[PDB]
Design a protein around this ligand. Structure first.
Ligand SMILES: NCCc1ccc(O)c(O)c1
Ligand SMILES: NCCc1ccc(O)c(O)c1
Ligand SMILES: NCCc1ccc(O)c(O)c1
Ligand SMILES: NCCc1ccc(O)c(O)c1
Ligand SMILES: [Fe+3]
Ligand SMILES: [Fe+3]
Ligand SMILES: [Fe+3]
Ligand SMILES: [Fe+3]
Lengths: 458, 458, 458, 458
């Protein structure tokens, strides 16, 4: 339903854009996007006048100086000179005018251009830079939003509502760096956990990826994945951070696509503490604690898989809503439902595959269609809800998927790039060569250390 | 007094070696170092027989097979062939014999060699690999050890003893990953903190490094470095981790040199919660909470300085006690007492310099001797205790010190090398090329990401 | 016929091995391979005695010291300890004994082992290190060897024999660094060249790779590829060196597979000055000057293709005869007959494809089988002679072929590796980490230069 | 006298600039630098009008469109916004106008600005990109220029003039890629060569760098550096190319500073075939064949020294005349006269040091001043002519000099950067990130090859 989530997010965004028009029409000056800085407003205007004699842009620049505005950058470059037949007439302005004088001279600039817009298109969808703001803003932007899910199967029990309230309070009031508040579990949830644990463990020897099996074995040895005791979150978070360098974060409510992908970028995984309804233990209408504990968490213990997911998250940064949907679809057809070709046979590592017993049976059956993984194909192919998936993609080696994702991100246009810093666990934008040099200096230092090591050995 | 600490550690180690002889002399088989594995014992013997005709090593290897021992690696190579005049006769054995049969055939091997030893010298001083064991073992190895310091100035007040008990309980019972337990502060300690804060802040505008000043300003803005409220440890730890990727760890008792250097390697700094005695606010007999908060913590906020310290810690890994002393001396003459040449004039960034008002006055005065920093010279030059330092080293740029330390580590012999992983914050030994290739793969992946970024920009 | 050449070379080598046995049998000491150094002989012996009690290797090492031999390295390590079920009993010796005393004590060592051999297997097939020896030794090893080719079509004309004599004299007496001696061309050869040039150029607009077309256009513009004048070798060599960093070398006679691959490694291509027989202008029984000028030379102007060929040559270094055959087959199915998928359609870049008009027609026809390129598949699939090829491999991008060859070389076992130095155009073996560090230093210097450039730009 | 050469070159250049004014003054449109392309002229104009109300730049841009000109890039950005107090008012234009209409509308643009210039300053001093043009253009630019040197000591003999004619004909008519035309030597020159060879070899055991000594030994072993036979140029060129990857080029006449530095960049060294005058064998008024054969050639055989010289040459590319003088001075105080600190004592490797017996005696004497090498200090300190040098710089390790030169080039501003390609021995400008990525791809490929090698070893 995450593709549904991405579609809902993008349609909500476009509706907001569809509602971003002034209530009162009739003003041709309503499309001039501007922002105000230090009492004045900095903005931009583009003109596309045809032919060559009508070059009255002087009047427009006679407008700009009419109020002693602060010009950041004026430029003019008639089109069809660098490329012919694809661009159109344009000339770039960026200027700061007194907010009162801004409209006054924009009235005069209306005497120069009528049928064009500002040259600056979509600037960027905002994204965090460090883990701290990732928690702080995305809890503030996700405040006061309870989940109803009444029409969903079950969820009519008041005790379920109280448990949801408790989980929401724990997650929403949780800050970064803090330890996971331990949550109790009565007999019903632990019994359901025991049932699902037994049913899934008895079949995990089959159809499952060997990495998943070994990760599960190590976790049940250390973290305590047993039918009797449902594991908490702090212990598994510590284990993952220690070995795979990964950690979790409790969350509830309607998570967007963007925040989830940002979390994925920061090598942190959002999670929910409560589990599915006891009336429906075989499947859950919404992914729950057991879903991640058995579908996401185990295969997430792989260093290469974690790196691949992190690369996905990195590519997700600052991407437009369409690209967000594409990345969500790729996640669905790779992480939630992913197939591997190892030891000759095909095994399953998908989270959704590793979270539903019926889907576990169906995935390796011959009824559903299976094909080799393709980034673009997985990014276009649609999904289904409340029904078994019939189309699957297989990746024999996670390295192959990683490099394919590298290529996909490379061909994905962005006005910048993104680098991750595990030292401070931060994100440094890549829009000027100076940051590239800064990163390369550390790269060279690591290379020198490696050379010293190589000299030492032998 | 850390050079004194390193000297005490090495003399204790050699005394243990001086006490590692059997109580009963007269057995020429007491020097055969051996360890027992799986019911049998794996060990090694070397022989240096002169001339060339006495080559009765066959008898020794007639000894080895006399009990069907498990031979790991037998080798023989007469000396003076590769290098002449510096080595001596040797031949390497490594074998596993039944622990009962081991001594029985060693009796026969005594018929072959008498005046030689085992070929395996010092294997390695054990060191941790991840942060978890760094806490767990080094708290278990440092258990049940209270500090007396009665002869030290003050410390006769029972309330001071109770405060020391509280700090020791907090630190010794603190585990990795846990948040810092907040510790209260009565009027006396906060008043002393206010006094020292005022006295040091009023002079930090002078004689101090600009990095220290800006770090202090940022901390007092965010962490709350003010005379009224003494800052805690969790907040500053969070700040350092967020910006400089550094964290602290409470500790008490007699810290060795080795564990401190290992902590330094893991980008974690050991610290004490209590402060100096109110009777002696001008100086402390032992470094305290204010010492690190004002001497270590501020300058530690520098990315380059933190990296330099981390490189020091990395070089410290597995080093023999003599090298431990050398590294301690370098730390004393660089971190505790370090001078920088910036903006034309000379400023101070040393922790001890930035922790004593009298030493702050004395350091930039013309009475003490000042010279340019040299790694070897700082590693040989001695110290003094309870008195102002007269010899100082200056480093105009922390990068220069960093590369000099790189060179010093390069010329420092080790049977391996060390690499740091900030993703999982772990340590991977460097003794086989395969680990080098593993690291280089990630290096190449980062290079590919940088190339993609460079393609994107422009 | 190059696969035939590789097969002939390997069967000749094994026949020499089959003839490397002493004429007089009956001596169990005839299999002890040894070499003599400075009046003594350095060699090695292996023993595989079963069980554990028969450990009379002492007697063998009682043999070694019986003549005061010079022992380089004695080792002993019973098998089934590191790996069980695949190895067998062994222990390594390497020793130098007086050449007269060598056989005398080998007689005694025969009292210890009878059914085993020396531990050192195939050391290496010798290969050059620089361009100079590549010319000097491989002309000395290929001296006094005329080509007969009488049974081949044509070649009964005495004038053809005289032309072959002239070409052989020019090539065989040509030294490295010298300019190409210009060779005249009478009316017959230039007329045949005009005919083949017209026929191939009229069709090169079709079925041919765009890189080939542009390279041919540039060459005919500069080098002078025209039907009227047959181009010489010095001009095209200068052009290739200037642009693609490649050069040619005249050669005749029966070229082995090894020397050709070594030349390929050194970014130099062996060539013949004479052309095919006028009686058979449509096809040649043996590749000639026009074959390379139109099949090899043009596509060789590609930087990426030249790099790919150079990587092939690099992988060829020191490879055993079987691997030589594999590399030859890969060259045949990639260089001589290679298909590319560009601009949607499939084009041909194979040298043999680009050298035969009939094969040019046949290659893009639907009768022959066409498949995607696979390194292993192309290395196993056989060939045919004097008949059109029915099986072809296609590579959409030369980079894909390059990385596949990288992988193939990686999985190809060698006791060392090879690096190329275009500064001195030499080859440095890679068998010790020190050379790796030496190379990495230059790599880091280039990285620093790139960082300086990046800082400068912008 | 090379500093004199650089000074003469720069004063000639500025005199040409001082003579680049129109013969007829009085036209305020004579300073508008313009170039004509495809029948029209592309150029640029800058205006610095004070205050803010006089913003009549519209009129100037009303001028530009008055003839339907082709505008490449118009920009406007008032100063004091990004940086205050150091820049002045400016706005950038670059436009192409009909060459007849260009002056016509420039007349109107004179009504807008009078006291300013074009915004494009010095574009670049032209430099070659490959070895071929380096020879072709710099022989065409240096055509018909005989050397007089009559006032110089000796050189009154007609036979000397004839020898100079022969050398000039050989060098000036020599093309790249061609072998060195061998030049005969009568009894007088070979006798002088024998004398200087004996005198310099008898002292080269002293005061000389060990690298020079070993290089000389290897050359006299192979190339044939003996008093009886004066060595030619082709043999030594082959030797240097084979080992150090360096080659020579005959040249005569008044060589500029720029062409010499470009040659140095291309790892090629200009040289003269004739030698000094027999009347003055102890010293030469101008450097000759023996000077380079004994001063430049031997120490040039060092890989590190050759790399350092190549880095100097690389930095020299496109540098302005002042920077050319700086580089020349650095060459004089490093290559011509350089001191090294090895084995404890100080030795000499300077070319001029290694070319004059009297200067050889004087250099290691205590009369001249000796100091540690500094790039800036050597780039500012002046010289003397026909007299012994009194000031010398010493570099203990050529790597130190190399990295200091790296830093000096880094701080040297250029609108681009330079990279060398030994594969095709070419120069690729570094002004766009795409070329950086192209280079980095090959760097990564070499890294992958190194990783494969490292995997193979062990
Ligand atoms: N993004 C939609 C919610 C979600 C998150 C993580 C999962 O593993 C999953 O199956 C579903
Ligand atoms: N190592 C001795 C104790 C110590 C630790 C850190 C310091 O900064 C300091 O001044 C003293
Ligand atoms: N190696 C066999 C001879 C040969 C060499 C080069 C070729 O391009 C070719 O077609 C044939
Ligand atoms: N550049 C001035 C001429 C010159 C060139 C090379 C030298 O080594 C030298 O001493 C003098
Ligand atoms: Fe899931
Ligand atoms: Fe301190
Ligand atoms: Fe061919
Ligand atoms: Fe010189």
């Amino acid at each position: 339903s995450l593709i549904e989530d991405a579609r809902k997010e993008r349609e909500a965004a476009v509706a907001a854009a569809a509602a971003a028009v002034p209530s009162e029409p009739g003003d041709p000056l309503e499309a001039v996007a501007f922002e105000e800085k230090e009492g004045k407003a900095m903005l931009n205007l583009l003109f596309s006048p045809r032919a060559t004699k009508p070059s009255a842009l002087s009047r427009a620049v006679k407008v700009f100086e009419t109020f002693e505005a602060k010009i950041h950058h004026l430029e003019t470059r008639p089109a069809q000179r660098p490329r012919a037949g694809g661009p159109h007439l344009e000339y770039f302005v960026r200027l700061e005018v007194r907010r009162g004088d801004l409209a006054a001279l924009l009235s005069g600039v209306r005497q120069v251009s009528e049928d064009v817009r500002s040259p600056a298109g979509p600037k960027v969808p905002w994204f965090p830079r460090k883990v701290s703001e990732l928690d702080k803003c995305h809890h503030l932007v996700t405040k006061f939003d309870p989940d109803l899910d009444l029409d969903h199967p079950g969820f009519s029990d008041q005790v379920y509502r109280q448990r949801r309230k408790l989980i929401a309070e724990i997650a929403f009031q949780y800050r970064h760096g803090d330890p996971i508040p331990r949550v109790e579990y009565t007999a019903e949830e632990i019994a359901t956990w025991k049932e699902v644990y037994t049913t899934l463990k008895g079949l995990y020897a089959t159809h499952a990826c060997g990495e998943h099996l070994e990760a599960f074995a190590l976790l049940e040895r250390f973290s305590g994945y047993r039918e009797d005791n449902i594991p908490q979150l702090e212990d598994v978070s510590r284990f993952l951070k220690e070995r795979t360098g990964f950690q979790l974060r409790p969350v509830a409510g309607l998570l967007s696509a963007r925040d989830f992908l940002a979390s994925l970028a920061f090598r942190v995984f959002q999670c929910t503490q409560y589990i599915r309804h006891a009336s429906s233990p075989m499947h859950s209408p919404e992914p729950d604690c057991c879903h991640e504990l058995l579908g996401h968490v185990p295969m997430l213990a792989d260093r290469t898989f974690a790196q691949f997911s992190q690369d996905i998250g990195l590519a997700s940064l600052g991407a437009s809503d369409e690209e967000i949907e594409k990345l969500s679809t790729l996640y669905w057809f790779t992480v939630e439902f992913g197939l591997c070709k190892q030891n000759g046979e095909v095994k399953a590592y998908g989270a959704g595959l590793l979270s539903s017993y019926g889907e576990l049976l169906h995935c390796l059956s011959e009824e559903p269609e299976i094909r080799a993984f393709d980034p673009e194909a997985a990014a276009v192919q649609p999904y289904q809800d409340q029904t078994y998936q019939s189309v699957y993609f297989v990746s024999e080696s996670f390295s192959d998927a990683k490099d394919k994702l590298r290529s996909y991100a490379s061909r994905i246009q962005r006005p910048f790039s993104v680098k991750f810093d595990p030292y401070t666990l931060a994100i440094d934008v890549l829009d000027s060569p100076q940051a590239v040099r800064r990163s390369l200096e550390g790269v060279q230092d690591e290379l020198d250390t490696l050379a010293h090591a190589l000299s030492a050995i032998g």
